[PDB]
Each structure stands twice: as structure tokens, then as C-alpha cells.
Design a protein around this nucleic acid. Sequence first.
RNA 1: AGCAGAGUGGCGCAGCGGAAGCGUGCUGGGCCCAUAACCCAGAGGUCGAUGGAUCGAAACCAUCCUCUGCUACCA
Lengths: 109, 266, 422
Amino acid sequence: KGGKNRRRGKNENESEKRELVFKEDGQEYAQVIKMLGNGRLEAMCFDGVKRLCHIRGKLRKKVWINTSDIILVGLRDYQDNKADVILKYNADEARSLKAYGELPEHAKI
Amino acid sequence: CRFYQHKFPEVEDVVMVNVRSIAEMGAYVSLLEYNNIEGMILLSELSRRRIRSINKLIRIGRNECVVVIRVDKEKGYIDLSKRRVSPEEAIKCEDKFTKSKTVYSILRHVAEVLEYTKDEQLESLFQRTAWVFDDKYKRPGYGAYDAFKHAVSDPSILDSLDLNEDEREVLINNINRRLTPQAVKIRADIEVACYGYEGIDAVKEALRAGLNCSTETMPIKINLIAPPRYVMTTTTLERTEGLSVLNQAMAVIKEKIEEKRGVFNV
Amino acid sequence: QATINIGTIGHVAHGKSTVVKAISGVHTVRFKNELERNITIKLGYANAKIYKLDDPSCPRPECYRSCGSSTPDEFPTDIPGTKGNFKLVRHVSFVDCPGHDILMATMLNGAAVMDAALLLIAGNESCPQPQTSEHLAAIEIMKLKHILILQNKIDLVKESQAKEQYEQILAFVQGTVAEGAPIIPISAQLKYNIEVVCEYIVKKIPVPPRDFTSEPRLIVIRSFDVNKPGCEVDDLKGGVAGGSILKGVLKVGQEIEVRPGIVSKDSEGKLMCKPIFSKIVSLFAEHNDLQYAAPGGLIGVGTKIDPTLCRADRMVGQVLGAVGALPEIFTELEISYFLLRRLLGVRTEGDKKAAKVQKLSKNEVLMVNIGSLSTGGRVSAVKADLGKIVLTNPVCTEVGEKIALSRRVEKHWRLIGWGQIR
RNA sequence: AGCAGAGUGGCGCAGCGGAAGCGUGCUGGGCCCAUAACCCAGAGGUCGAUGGAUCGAAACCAUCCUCUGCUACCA
């Protein structure tokens, strides 16, 4: 935002930086395809399978996930088409992961 | 020095200025349409509409056309206004501004050699020469440029009143260099559609007769742009003497070609 | 000059410039250059000199060896001999006709003044290909049979496909002369077997008997780009006709008459036409000066006509006779005729379409290609072996010879039949 | 080839007889709690060659070349 107010009643902040789970079992890296409204959003997984991603509590209006960029997504235990967002990263964090050679080397930022 | 026939402007005349400062109450400006005398513009009489910006209107280092609203003759306060200005006046004033600049540059060569240690030198040259050139032809809309332009093309104008020295060469050079090359927009319009085979030699007789009553050795400019079209730029004067050369010559080519077979364009 | 006119006709997509430059050494070219949407669709012109080192192969100027430039994939080289000057056998002339079907009427016209042909077949498309048959049939009607089939585009076409194609063409044309015409497969991407073509064209195609003593007739097919350069205008010292002469030695300074004429002012009927008379300025063929213009050759006759008649291609199929030629200038004409029982020049992979065309009905406009002329005319009387046609622009009929008759099947005219003037 | 335009000083268009002209963009500042709108501030520099007048020439005027626009042919 551009300053304003009423934005201090509540817990500043910030990311004192930090670090770094993965993947886990059904809990992996994806890239934002589109940017729907209402709340949900689209995101193609890095493996090759598409899926539709869903936001998670807290991260609601506490973290904006602009279009295009890596993001951490849990897969639903039983559901294929819909999947559940976790834990986003940083663009710097995503290029460090790419340099390490753990996610596939296909997408640009 | 003065660029104009009168030293001081009148009332309701169109003039030019050059902005040298921007005032709170308008604009205090120097003239370059007369002496470097001071004239004051006022904020109220610049436009009839709002004004958001202010440097996207008037700013320093701009020629601006304006009307002299009032003048104090004794004091030397030239009240000024930009409220009544039309683009037609701008064309008329830009011409007079530009023409005075070139005429005063001609009347600067005179001062390069003569005694000019004092600023009033050019003023002495200006009053005595300029006035008798322009006053005689101001009522018909001519400037002192007309008088000089007439002298280069027929020299009796500058020999009718005091002729200067060394001036004459530079005067001739600058008149003949800048106001030429000098020009004919004469182009013939000729159309032909022959069934002849003797047309090739027929056209040659017709081409060489573009101007009647001239020598066989007259140089002309032949041009072929397309097969039926024969353009002859005839003898190059000013295009007010070669009118008969243009008109009657067109009849020759179209007539000469009809006699040798068939119908043609007239 | 020239001794024979060999034509280079051939259906779409075989490449014209590669083959034409190998035979003549003179590019086929015309308006809009640019280049060519595909293969030349204009009536190209070219001449050439054919010499021997006492070998059936034809040298270049540099007769030690010849390294092509058709493709940089490989180097195609051929050896005509070794050097010490070569003996001139003759001067040949070509007639590059249009290779596209719509241009059929023009292909007919240009073809009708040749003394032999080269059927350029392409192996890419259908085996009993429409245009091959169209060409062949027209050739046997006009009065020629001096044909050398040339398989011009089989560079990447496999040997089964190319074999099947020559078989099907030669089997369809079982009633048209083609059994005494050789079939020379060549490369057009490596210019190979070109040397053997030189042996063929001197064998199958000698100079046919030409009548020098008989009165000059020149048939103009192509206009001239004269003039408009410099220095000294306007219009020109005049206008050049690309024509072949099929009868008589036309000499320099002779007067020549163009005989279809120009129609008299304020005509209320279809008569009267008046021939135009022009004196011959120059008799140019190849790049060598001449004082004569022997028959059997395509020659540029500069004549004293003025620019407007040559400013565009407007002298296509005009008959020129020296001078005050006896040939009649009909405006309405008595055709004897016969029709084909198939529609010629069209046939595709699937029966659709090409069968028997219905009988002609009066007051329909049909292209009568008479001589090298191409006029349009309407049929006023229609009996089976006697139709009367009225022509828009008059036709000089040199002799009663042949005609080719086409009907507007769809977008353009297509060949339906032939016959003889009565 | 006839006619027309141009031969950057960020972009694009190229303005006139006073050395970036116009429109736009980028970058920064100002206003505002903030954004938009609005207001200001920029930037190594014969602007294809050969010449003349000139205090000076993309621009005042010529002689040449090249690229394109419209028209259009020599080849």
C-alpha cells in the first residue's frame, strides 16, 4: 500500500529470513498460470500435470501472490483436479532452488 | 538598433517581442520589433480561458505576437496585450520581423567599414536610407526589401538616391544569392496518339519550334515523362513573360502531328 | 539468327529458369520482376548458339569443364571436352510458353509459330496429368510431331513413381504421336544428362523446309519496350515487334503491313478495317546485327510504328504481310469444326470432372484461336459442320489452315475442339 | 526513371531563414495518509557528401549520392 493507516493494529512483521522445506510427499512446487478472482486461483505443477490451486487460511489477505512465480502446493489426498496451496516462497528463494537443481529448469521469472 | 521605420509603436498595431523575464503581474518584455525599449504585458489580457500550466504558455526566449494597447509617448511606457491576436496577424508580423532582420543585415555591411565605435552609427544609416526606400512603398504593402529587390533586377532604384561604395557588390551578391535560384514552373501539357510512322521526325520539327521568333540556337529543357506526354520547360524568365511561350506552343505540336495522319488530342 | 523454334511448354511446378538457362543460357523474363509466383506465366523469349567440339555435348564459352551452381548440396560437374575453339552448328531459338492452365489461349498462340517442342513433365503430381495431353493434342493439330518429352522434375521423385507417370502418359496418348518422340529423364537440381539432350535436339529436330522465295509473312506475338529512355523525345523512333517469320525472307528497309487493321471512325456495322503500314528500321536477332530475316526464326523487327502500339502488350497474335498482302481480313467467318468427346485440359485424381460437353448454342461467346490470333466471337448460326461466327476485332486469315475452339466452362475458357476455315 | 520526403541529440513523427521542433516515452522530483489525475526537472552530439552567400546552416540556397513514399521503365 501507499502508507495510509489502520495498518498497524496487527503484527508488523516481516520475514526475518528463512528457510526452507520442499516438496514433501504430495506437497510440491508449482507455478501460477492465471489469476482468477473471488479467491481461488490457477497454477500448473512443475511435473507436467496441471491442477487448480486453492488458497489457505492466514495467507488469505496476509500475503499477496501476484501472477507468475513459484509456489508450494499440497495435493489433496484423494482429489486430482483441485489442489491446495501452502507456503509460497520468495523469487530469490526460487532462483536459489533452481541453481541448486532440485526443481525442474524450465520456467523463467 | 531600431528595426522599424518609426522608433516608437502606435496604438492598436501588431508587434513582436521577445520575453526576457516573467513578472507576477504579467510579463515585462523587450521589443525586437522596434528598439530594445521596454513594454509591459499584463496577466488579465493574455487569454479568455483558464490557465493551468504557465510555462507551457509564455516563457523566456520566445518571440510572441502582441498588440500595443496604449503608449506613454513622453515617458516611454509601452503597454502591451496578447488578448487580441489572430494567426493571420502572426503571418504578417513574422514576415515583417524576418524581412527587417535581413534588411538590417544588409544595412550592417555598411557599418562594418564606416565609423561605428558608437551604437548610434546604425541609427544614422537607418534613418537616411531606409525611410526613402520604404515610405514611398509602405502604402502599397512593401518593405525596404522590395526596393532592394527591384534594384538588383533593374539598377536605377539605388542610383536614384545616394549610392554607397563597396556596398554595391555585397548588396548584389546577397540579393542575387538569397532571392533566387530563380525559377520557372513552366511545364508544357501535350497529348498525342499517332497512327503515323513519320511521327518521330514530325515531333522533332515541332519540338524545336516551342518559341516562335527565336534563333535556331536557343537552349531549352526537353523532358520525356511518358510516351504521349511531351513536356517542354520553355525559356526561363519569371513565368509572367513566358506565358505566350507556354500557351501558343501547345497548339504547334498538336497541329503538326494531325497533318501527317489521323486524329489527335487537341 | 535462328533456324528452328523449339518450345518449352510444361505444367505447373517443374522449374523453368533452371532448365531454360541450361539449354539457351538466356533467362526467361518479363513484366513484374519481382520473379514468378511459381513458373513463368508470360510468353518468354530467348535465342542461343549451339556449337560442337565434334562431340554430341554442347560447350559453354569456357569449354574445358563446367561446374554448376544449381545447388550447394553437392557439386554437379560435366565435361564437354577441351579447348581450342568449337565449330558452330547452328543458331537456335526458343519459345517459352506459359505453364499455367488459365493462360491456355496464350499458350496456344505462342505454340502456333514453333517448329518443335519440349514437353516438360513434373513427377510431383498426377500420372496422366491434364495439361500434358492438352499440349500434345494441340501440337499434332497445328502440324508438328517433332517432340522430345523431357522429365524435368524427378530430382526427389522415386523411380517407381516416375516410371508409372511416363507409362500412363504414353498409354493415354495412344492416338496422338509420341512413340517416335524420345523421353529423356534429366536432373534440374544437378543439371545431369543435359549433354545427351544436345544430341537429341540436333537429331529429332533438323531444319524443316523453309520457303525463301515466297512472299514475307511475319506473325507478331510480343510487343516492344520502345521507347522512353534518352536522349531526345518524345514517343519513339519507333516500335519493335517480337515475331517469328514462317514464310519468306524479310529484307531490311522493306515496308510491312499489319493486316487485321484498325477500324474506321464512326462505324455503324462491323466493317471497315484498314491495315497500318510501317517501314522496317532494323532486323535484330540474338545480339548480332543482320541485314536479312530468314524464315524459321524469331526476330525483333523494329518498324516505324509509334510508342502507343508497343507501350503494353497489344500486338499479341497479329499477322503482318509485306506489303499489300493478298490474305483476306474477315470480320465474320465460316468455320468448319469438330469437337472432342472429352473435355481437354481438365481431369483430376477423382472423376470430377471431365466428360462429354454438350453441343454449342447460338449467341454464346467463344474464343477462336485462328493462326496466332486470339479473337472472341459469337456464334450466329450453329449447324454441326457449319457454324458462322462474328468476331469482335477482324482476323487476317493467311490460309485456311487450322483453328482451335474453346468454350467458357467456368472461370476461364477450356479447349473443346478444332477444325479448319472454309 | 517523373514527382515527394528524409539521411536524430532518448523514442516516433521529421519543424522553421537562431544550434533538437512537435507529439510521446523513460527516469527523478512535487502534491496527497497513499494511488490515480495534475505540476515540474532531464540527455557527451556539422543531423549522408561536395560547394556558395552568410555571424552561422538538418534547417538560407545550390551541386551530387543513397534509402523509401506515390507514379512507373530502362534493365
